[PDB]
Coordinates of C-alpha atoms and ligand atoms in Angstrom, one line a residue:
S143 CA -173.5 -57.2 16.2
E144 CA -171.2 -59.7 15.0
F145 CA -172.6 -62.4 17.4
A146 CA -173.8 -64.7 14.5
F147 CA -170.5 -64.7 12.6
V148 CA -168.4 -67.8 13.1
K149 CA -165.1 -66.9 14.8
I150 CA -161.9 -68.5 16.0
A151 CA -161.9 -69.0 19.9
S152 CA -159.5 -66.5 21.5
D153 CA -157.2 -69.5 22.6
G154 CA -157.2 -70.7 18.9
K155 CA -158.4 -74.3 19.7
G156 CA -161.8 -74.1 17.9
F157 CA -164.5 -72.0 16.4
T158 CA -167.1 -70.1 18.2
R159 CA -170.6 -68.7 17.1
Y160 CA -173.2 -67.1 19.3
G161 CA -170.7 -67.0 22.2
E162 CA -170.3 -70.7 22.3
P163 CA -168.2 -73.3 20.8
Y164 CA -168.9 -74.4 17.2
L165 CA -168.1 -77.8 15.9
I166 CA -168.4 -78.5 11.9
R167 CA -171.0 -81.2 11.3
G168 CA -170.4 -80.9 7.6
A169 CA -170.9 -82.1 4.1
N170 CA -169.6 -80.9 0.6
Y171 CA -172.2 -79.7 -1.6
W172 CA -170.3 -78.0 -4.5
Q173 CA -173.3 -78.6 -6.9
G174 CA -175.5 -76.4 -4.9
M175 CA -175.1 -73.3 -7.0
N176 CA -176.1 -75.0 -10.2
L177 CA -179.1 -76.8 -8.6
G178 CA -180.3 -73.7 -7.3
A179 CA -180.3 -71.9 -10.7
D180 CA -183.8 -71.4 -12.5
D181 CA -185.1 -74.1 -14.8
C182 CA -183.6 -72.0 -17.9
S183 CA -180.0 -72.4 -16.7
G184 CA -180.3 -76.1 -15.8
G185 CA -181.1 -75.9 -12.3
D186 CA -183.6 -77.8 -10.2
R187 CA -184.5 -75.5 -7.4
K188 CA -187.1 -77.8 -5.6
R189 CA -184.7 -80.6 -5.6
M190 CA -181.9 -78.3 -4.0
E191 CA -184.5 -77.3 -1.4
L192 CA -185.2 -80.9 -0.6
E193 CA -181.5 -81.8 -0.5
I194 CA -180.9 -79.1 2.1
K195 CA -183.8 -80.2 4.2
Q196 CA -182.5 -83.9 3.9
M197 CA -179.3 -82.7 5.1
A198 CA -180.7 -80.6 8.0
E199 CA -182.5 -83.8 9.1
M200 CA -179.2 -85.7 9.2
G201 CA -177.7 -83.1 11.5
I202 CA -175.6 -81.1 9.0
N203 CA -174.8 -77.6 10.1
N204 CA -172.2 -76.6 7.4
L205 CA -171.9 -77.0 3.8
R206 CA -168.8 -76.4 1.8
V207 CA -169.9 -75.2 -1.6
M208 CA -168.4 -73.9 -4.9
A209 CA -168.7 -70.1 -5.4
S210 CA -166.9 -70.1 -8.8
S211 CA -167.0 -71.8 -12.1
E212 CA -165.5 -70.7 -15.4
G213 CA -166.4 -71.2 -19.1
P214 CA -166.1 -71.2 -21.9
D215 CA -169.2 -73.5 -22.0
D216 CA -167.9 -75.8 -24.7
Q217 CA -165.3 -77.5 -22.5
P218 CA -165.5 -81.1 -21.3
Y219 CA -165.0 -82.1 -17.7
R220 CA -166.7 -79.1 -16.0
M221 CA -169.9 -77.7 -14.7
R222 CA -172.3 -76.3 -17.3
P223 CA -173.7 -73.7 -17.6
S224 CA -170.7 -71.8 -16.0
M225 CA -171.2 -69.1 -13.5
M226 CA -168.3 -66.9 -15.4
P227 CA -168.3 -67.9 -19.0
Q228 CA -165.5 -65.3 -19.7
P229 CA -163.6 -62.9 -17.4
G230 CA -165.8 -60.5 -15.8
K231 CA -169.0 -61.7 -17.6
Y232 CA -171.6 -63.6 -15.5
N233 CA -174.3 -66.0 -16.1
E234 CA -176.9 -64.3 -13.8
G235 CA -179.2 -67.4 -14.0
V236 CA -176.3 -69.5 -12.3
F237 CA -175.3 -66.6 -9.8
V238 CA -179.0 -66.4 -8.6
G239 CA -178.5 -70.2 -7.9
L240 CA -175.9 -69.2 -5.3
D241 CA -178.4 -66.6 -3.8
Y242 CA -180.9 -69.3 -3.3
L243 CA -178.4 -71.8 -2.0
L244 CA -177.3 -69.4 0.7
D245 CA -180.9 -68.4 1.4
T246 CA -182.1 -71.9 2.0
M247 CA -179.0 -72.6 4.1
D248 CA -180.0 -69.7 6.3
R249 CA -183.5 -71.2 6.8
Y250 CA -181.9 -74.4 8.1
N251 CA -179.4 -72.6 10.1
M252 CA -176.4 -74.0 8.3
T253 CA -173.1 -72.1 7.6
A254 CA -171.4 -72.2 4.3
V255 CA -167.6 -72.4 3.4
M256 CA -167.4 -70.4 0.1
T257 CA -164.8 -71.8 -2.3
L258 CA -163.6 -69.1 -4.5
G259 CA -161.6 -71.2 -7.1
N260 CA -160.4 -74.6 -7.9
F261 CA -157.0 -75.9 -8.8
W262 CA -158.8 -78.8 -10.7
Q263 CA -160.5 -78.8 -14.1
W264 CA -164.2 -79.6 -13.1
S265 CA -165.1 -75.9 -12.7
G266 CA -162.7 -74.6 -15.1
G267 CA -160.3 -73.4 -12.3
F268 CA -156.7 -72.3 -12.3
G269 CA -156.1 -74.1 -15.5
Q270 CA -158.9 -71.9 -17.2
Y271 CA -157.5 -68.6 -15.9
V272 CA -154.1 -69.7 -17.3
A273 CA -155.9 -70.5 -20.7
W274 CA -157.5 -67.0 -20.8
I275 CA -154.1 -65.4 -20.1
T276 CA -152.0 -67.3 -22.6
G277 CA -155.0 -67.0 -25.0
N278 CA -154.6 -70.8 -25.6
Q279 CA -157.8 -72.8 -25.1
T280 CA -156.2 -76.3 -25.4
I281 CA -155.9 -77.3 -21.7
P282 CA -154.1 -80.6 -21.3
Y283 CA -156.9 -82.5 -19.5
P284 CA -155.4 -85.4 -17.9
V285 CA -157.3 -88.0 -19.9
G286 CA -155.9 -90.8 -22.3
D287 CA -152.1 -90.5 -22.4
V288 CA -152.0 -87.1 -20.4
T289 CA -151.2 -87.6 -16.7
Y290 CA -152.3 -85.6 -13.7
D291 CA -148.7 -84.3 -13.2
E292 CA -148.8 -82.9 -16.7
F293 CA -152.2 -81.1 -16.1
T294 CA -150.8 -79.8 -12.6
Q295 CA -147.7 -78.2 -14.2
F296 CA -150.0 -76.4 -16.5
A297 CA -152.6 -75.3 -13.9
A298 CA -149.7 -74.2 -11.4
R299 CA -148.5 -71.7 -13.8
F300 CA -151.4 -69.5 -12.3
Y301 CA -149.1 -68.7 -9.5
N302 CA -145.6 -70.1 -10.5
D303 CA -145.2 -68.4 -13.8
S304 CA -143.7 -64.9 -13.3
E305 CA -145.5 -63.5 -16.3
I306 CA -148.7 -65.4 -16.2
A307 CA -149.4 -65.2 -12.4
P308 CA -150.1 -61.3 -12.0
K309 CA -152.6 -61.3 -14.9
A310 CA -154.2 -64.4 -13.7
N311 CA -154.4 -63.3 -10.2
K312 CA -155.9 -59.9 -11.4
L313 CA -158.8 -61.9 -13.0
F314 CA -159.2 -64.1 -10.0
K315 CA -159.3 -61.1 -7.6
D316 CA -162.1 -59.5 -9.7
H317 CA -164.0 -62.6 -9.3
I318 CA -163.4 -62.7 -5.5
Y319 CA -164.5 -59.0 -5.4
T320 CA -167.7 -59.6 -7.3
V321 CA -168.7 -62.5 -5.0
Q322 CA -167.8 -60.9 -1.8
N323 CA -169.9 -57.8 -2.9
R324 CA -173.0 -59.6 -4.3
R325 CA -176.3 -58.5 -3.1
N326 CA -178.3 -61.7 -2.5
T327 CA -181.5 -61.1 -4.7
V328 CA -183.6 -63.5 -2.6
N329 CA -183.0 -62.1 1.0
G330 CA -181.2 -58.6 0.3
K331 CA -178.1 -59.4 2.5
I332 CA -174.6 -58.3 0.9
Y333 CA -172.4 -61.5 1.0
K334 CA -169.6 -59.9 3.0
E335 CA -172.2 -59.0 5.8
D336 CA -174.0 -62.4 5.6
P337 CA -173.3 -64.4 8.9
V338 CA -174.6 -67.4 7.0
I339 CA -171.2 -67.5 5.4
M340 CA -168.7 -69.1 7.8
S341 CA -165.5 -68.5 5.6
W342 CA -164.0 -67.5 2.3
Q343 CA -161.8 -70.4 0.9
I344 CA -159.1 -69.3 -1.6
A345 CA -159.3 -72.4 -3.7
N346 CA -159.9 -76.1 -3.8
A347 CA -156.6 -77.9 -3.2
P348 CA -153.8 -75.5 -4.5
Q349 CA -150.8 -77.8 -5.6
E350 CA -147.5 -76.5 -3.9
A351 CA -148.4 -72.7 -4.3
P352 CA -145.7 -70.5 -2.9
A353 CA -146.1 -69.0 0.7
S354 CA -146.1 -65.5 -0.8
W355 CA -149.2 -66.4 -2.9
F356 CA -151.2 -67.5 0.2
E357 CA -150.0 -64.4 2.1
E358 CA -151.1 -62.1 -0.6
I359 CA -154.5 -63.8 -1.5
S360 CA -155.5 -64.3 2.0
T361 CA -154.8 -60.8 2.9
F362 CA -156.8 -59.6 -0.1
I363 CA -159.9 -61.8 0.7
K364 CA -159.8 -60.6 4.4
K365 CA -159.6 -56.9 3.5
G366 CA -162.6 -57.7 1.2
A367 CA -164.7 -59.2 4.0
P368 CA -163.3 -58.3 7.4
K369 CA -166.1 -60.0 9.4
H370 CA -165.3 -63.4 7.9
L371 CA -162.9 -66.2 8.4
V372 CA -160.5 -67.1 5.6
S373 CA -159.3 -70.5 4.6
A374 CA -156.7 -71.9 2.4
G375 CA -158.3 -75.1 1.0
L376 CA -155.2 -77.3 1.2
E377 CA -155.3 -81.1 1.2
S378 CA -152.2 -81.3 3.6
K379 CA -151.3 -84.5 1.7
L380 CA -147.5 -84.0 2.0
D381 CA -145.6 -83.0 5.1
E382 CA -145.6 -80.3 7.8
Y383 CA -143.4 -77.8 5.7
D384 CA -146.1 -77.8 2.9
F385 CA -148.9 -77.5 5.6
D386 CA -147.0 -74.4 7.0
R387 CA -146.5 -72.8 3.6
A388 CA -150.2 -72.7 3.3
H389 CA -151.4 -71.9 6.8
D390 CA -148.7 -70.0 8.7
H391 CA -150.2 -66.6 7.7
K392 CA -151.9 -64.0 9.9
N393 CA -155.0 -64.1 7.5
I394 CA -155.4 -67.8 7.4
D395 CA -157.6 -68.3 10.3
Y396 CA -158.0 -72.1 10.4
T397 CA -156.4 -75.2 8.8
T398 CA -158.0 -78.0 6.6
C399 CA -157.1 -81.4 5.3
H400 CA -158.5 -83.8 2.6
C401 CA -158.1 -87.4 2.8
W402 CA -158.3 -89.6 -0.3
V403 CA -157.0 -93.2 0.0
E404 CA -158.1 -94.5 -3.3
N405 CA -156.9 -91.4 -5.3
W406 CA -153.6 -91.7 -3.4
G407 CA -153.0 -95.5 -4.2
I408 CA -153.5 -96.4 -0.3
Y409 CA -156.8 -98.3 -1.0
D410 CA -158.1 -100.5 -3.8
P411 CA -161.9 -100.9 -3.7
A412 CA -161.9 -104.0 -5.6
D413 CA -159.8 -105.7 -3.1
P414 CA -162.0 -107.3 -0.5
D415 CA -159.1 -107.3 2.2
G416 CA -158.1 -103.7 1.7
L417 CA -160.1 -101.9 4.3
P418 CA -157.7 -102.3 7.4
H419 CA -155.0 -100.5 5.6
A420 CA -157.2 -97.6 4.6
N421 CA -158.6 -97.4 8.2
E422 CA -154.9 -97.0 9.6
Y423 CA -154.0 -94.5 7.1
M424 CA -157.1 -92.4 8.1
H425 CA -156.0 -93.0 11.8
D426 CA -152.5 -91.7 11.3
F427 CA -153.7 -88.8 9.1
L428 CA -156.0 -87.5 11.7
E429 CA -153.5 -87.8 14.6
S430 CA -150.5 -86.1 12.5
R431 CA -152.6 -83.4 11.1
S432 CA -154.1 -82.7 14.3
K433 CA -150.5 -82.1 15.7
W434 CA -149.6 -79.9 12.9
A435 CA -152.7 -77.7 13.6
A436 CA -151.8 -77.6 17.2
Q437 CA -148.3 -76.3 16.5
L438 CA -149.7 -73.3 14.7
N439 CA -152.4 -73.0 17.4
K440 CA -155.3 -72.9 14.8
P441 CA -158.3 -75.1 14.4
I442 CA -158.6 -78.1 11.8
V443 CA -161.4 -79.3 9.8
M444 CA -161.2 -82.5 7.6
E445 CA -163.2 -80.8 4.8
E446 CA -163.0 -83.7 2.3
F447 CA -162.8 -87.4 2.6
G448 CA -164.6 -90.3 1.1
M449 CA -164.5 -93.8 -0.3
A450 CA -165.9 -95.8 -3.1
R451 CA -168.8 -98.4 -3.0
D452 CA -168.1 -102.2 -2.5
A453 CA -166.4 -102.9 -5.9
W454 CA -164.7 -105.9 -4.3
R455 CA -168.2 -107.9 -4.5
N456 CA -167.7 -108.1 -8.2
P457 CA -164.2 -107.0 -9.0
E458 CA -164.1 -107.8 -12.8
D459 CA -167.0 -105.7 -13.6
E460 CA -166.1 -101.9 -13.9
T461 CA -169.8 -100.6 -14.1
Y462 CA -170.9 -102.3 -10.9
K463 CA -168.6 -100.2 -8.9
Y464 CA -170.8 -97.0 -9.6
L465 CA -174.3 -98.4 -9.4
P466 CA -176.4 -97.0 -6.7
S467 CA -177.7 -100.6 -5.7
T468 CA -174.0 -101.5 -5.0
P469 CA -173.6 -101.7 -1.1
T470 CA -171.2 -99.4 0.9
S471 CA -170.1 -101.7 3.5
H472 CA -166.4 -100.6 3.3
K473 CA -167.3 -97.0 3.1
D474 CA -169.7 -97.4 6.0
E475 CA -166.8 -98.7 8.4
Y476 CA -164.3 -96.2 7.1
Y477 CA -166.7 -93.2 7.7
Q478 CA -167.6 -94.6 11.2
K479 CA -164.1 -95.0 12.3
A480 CA -163.1 -91.7 11.0
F481 CA -166.1 -90.1 12.8
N482 CA -165.5 -91.9 16.0
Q483 CA -162.0 -90.7 16.0
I484 CA -163.0 -87.0 15.2
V485 CA -165.5 -87.0 18.0
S486 CA -162.8 -88.2 20.5
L487 CA -160.2 -85.7 19.2
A488 CA -163.0 -82.9 19.4
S489 CA -163.5 -83.8 22.9
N490 CA -160.0 -82.7 23.8
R491 CA -160.4 -79.7 21.3
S492 CA -157.9 -81.0 18.9
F493 CA -160.2 -81.3 15.8
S494 CA -163.3 -79.1 14.9
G495 CA -165.2 -81.5 12.6
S496 CA -165.3 -82.4 9.0
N497 CA -167.2 -82.4 5.6
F498 CA -167.8 -85.7 3.9
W499 CA -167.3 -85.8 0.1
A500 CA -170.0 -85.5 -1.0
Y501 CA -173.8 -85.5 -0.7
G502 CA -175.5 -86.8 -3.8
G503 CA -179.0 -86.5 -2.4
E504 CA -181.8 -87.3 -5.0
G505 CA -179.2 -87.5 -7.9
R506 CA -178.3 -91.0 -9.2
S507 CA -175.4 -92.1 -11.5
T508 CA -178.0 -94.1 -13.6
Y509 CA -180.0 -91.0 -14.5
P510 CA -179.9 -89.3 -17.9
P511 CA -177.9 -85.9 -18.2
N512 CA -180.1 -82.8 -18.2
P513 CA -179.9 -80.6 -21.4
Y514 CA -176.6 -79.0 -20.5
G515 CA -175.1 -82.5 -20.1
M516 CA -174.9 -82.7 -16.4
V517 CA -175.9 -85.6 -14.3
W518 CA -175.9 -83.7 -11.1
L519 CA -174.7 -85.4 -7.8
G520 CA -171.7 -85.5 -5.5
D521 CA -169.2 -86.4 -8.3
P522 CA -168.0 -83.6 -10.4
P523 CA -167.9 -84.1 -14.2
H524 CA -164.2 -84.9 -14.3
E525 CA -164.9 -88.2 -12.6
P526 CA -167.1 -91.3 -13.1
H527 CA -170.7 -90.3 -11.9
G528 CA -171.6 -92.1 -8.6
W529 CA -168.0 -92.8 -7.3
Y530 CA -168.3 -91.2 -4.0
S531 CA -171.7 -89.6 -3.7
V532 CA -173.8 -90.3 -0.8
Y533 CA -177.3 -90.8 -1.8
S534 CA -180.4 -89.9 0.2
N535 CA -181.2 -93.5 1.2
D536 CA -177.7 -95.0 1.5
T537 CA -176.9 -97.0 4.6
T538 CA -174.1 -94.2 5.2
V539 CA -176.8 -91.7 6.1
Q540 CA -177.4 -93.3 9.4
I541 CA -173.8 -93.3 10.2
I542 CA -173.5 -89.6 9.3
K543 CA -176.5 -88.9 11.3
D544 CA -175.1 -90.6 14.5
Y545 CA -171.8 -88.7 14.1
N546 CA -173.6 -85.3 13.7
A547 CA -175.5 -86.2 17.0
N548 CA -172.2 -87.1 18.7
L549 CA -170.3 -84.0 17.5
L550 CA -173.4 -81.8 18.8
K551 CA -173.3 -83.7 22.0
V552 CA -169.5 -82.7 22.4
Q553 CA -170.1 -79.2 21.4
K554 CA -172.6 -79.0 24.2
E555 CA -170.1 -80.5 26.9
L556 CA -167.6 -77.9 25.7
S557 CA -170.1 -75.1 26.1
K558 CA -170.5 -75.7 29.9
Ligands
LIG382 O1 -161.7 -87.4 -6.1 C1 -162.6 -86.8 -5.2 C2 -162.5 -85.4 -5.0 O2 -161.1 -85.2 -4.5 C3 -160.7 -83.8 -4.5 O3 -159.6 -84.0 -5.6 C4 -158.9 -85.0 -6.2 C5 -157.5 -84.9 -5.5 C6 -157.4 -85.5 -4.2 O4 -156.0 -85.8 -4.1 O5 -156.5 -85.7 -6.4 C7 -157.4 -85.5 -7.7 O6 -157.8 -87.1 -7.9 C8 -156.5 -85.5 -8.8 O7 -155.5 -86.3 -8.8 C9 -158.6 -84.7 -7.5 O8 -159.7 -84.9 -8.4 C10 -161.9 -82.9 -4.6 O9 -161.4 -81.5 -4.2 C11 -162.6 -83.0 -5.8 O10 -161.8 -82.4 -6.8 C12 -162.8 -84.5 -6.2 O11 -164.0 -84.8 -6.6

């Protein structure tokens, strides 16, 4: 019986599970694995269990999590301790964190999108694999005078450099194999047989990877886990051509987009008048990506989006922007409008849900780092702590809760 496995509907316009439509009432929780680790490897398991419980009470049925991270552990801007400090060598204390993450998600009947790698630097990612291959541990982190474009050209050698790509992909493939074949030490399930996992996701946000790379990798992931969906992890921030290069492949089962107004220069959170322009952008983003998904006849999930706190209330004070006590009136309206639009599109089966970025839970940006230097919450350590996290008692919690109720209501209407 594969009844419990999330599937694509035979008409391609949404997901199914248990013989019924399945809508994604999601959140991002990439920190789950590290919080699930035992106290010795810097975890806080009781807090992870409470965070999952908090999320179940807000109606969340789906977490996108990180199922990779690379050392070596002396690197800035990344998760510590790492899951894979050197190629093929695993921090078992961190890996057991993933086991518990998946076991707790099961008890709350959530599904997981298992992200297998990262283009960005905060879990090591593609840039780290490249560093292992060239033997050169000086990654050009985009801090100070180094730009994102320069870091991107370095990391993109993972799949564009005809000498580096085959060796890098060999290491990445060994990691994919190890994760798909992990026996969960808590409940005994082998990951590739676990219906709790909705999909394997190639990577977070690959930047202009060639078509033949998505073709190859997705095929390999699917042969590795034939019961599961496979996903690309693309932002879809460019155009339809870019979207097709990632998604038009027999083993990419559904499509995704990521919407970042501040990061793309669309939205300035210090500007008291900037919200309407971000709302409109979110608005055309959802309508146009929706059309691109429909042209491939595959489902679409907005698997990342977010907004900063109300920095415009005190524009000239940088620290104010990240304080938990700072309100989120813009973020709240932005989330609410996007959610209302998704609910309306999902009613005509032209969108399948979303995962906000990202749940902070009980973490706060004012807390001290743990002994490995981590202030765990929704913002990875390449970014200011507290930028986008949604905290357990934020006003945005009610908005997300209502959205998850509306989206479940729609899934029920469609199940008739
Ligand atoms: O910044 C929030 C969240 O965004 C994702 O990555 C962003 C992408 C979005 O376009 O662009 C960057 O800002 C680099 O320019 C990158 O950090 C998300 O996947 C995660 O990495 C990040 O926390």
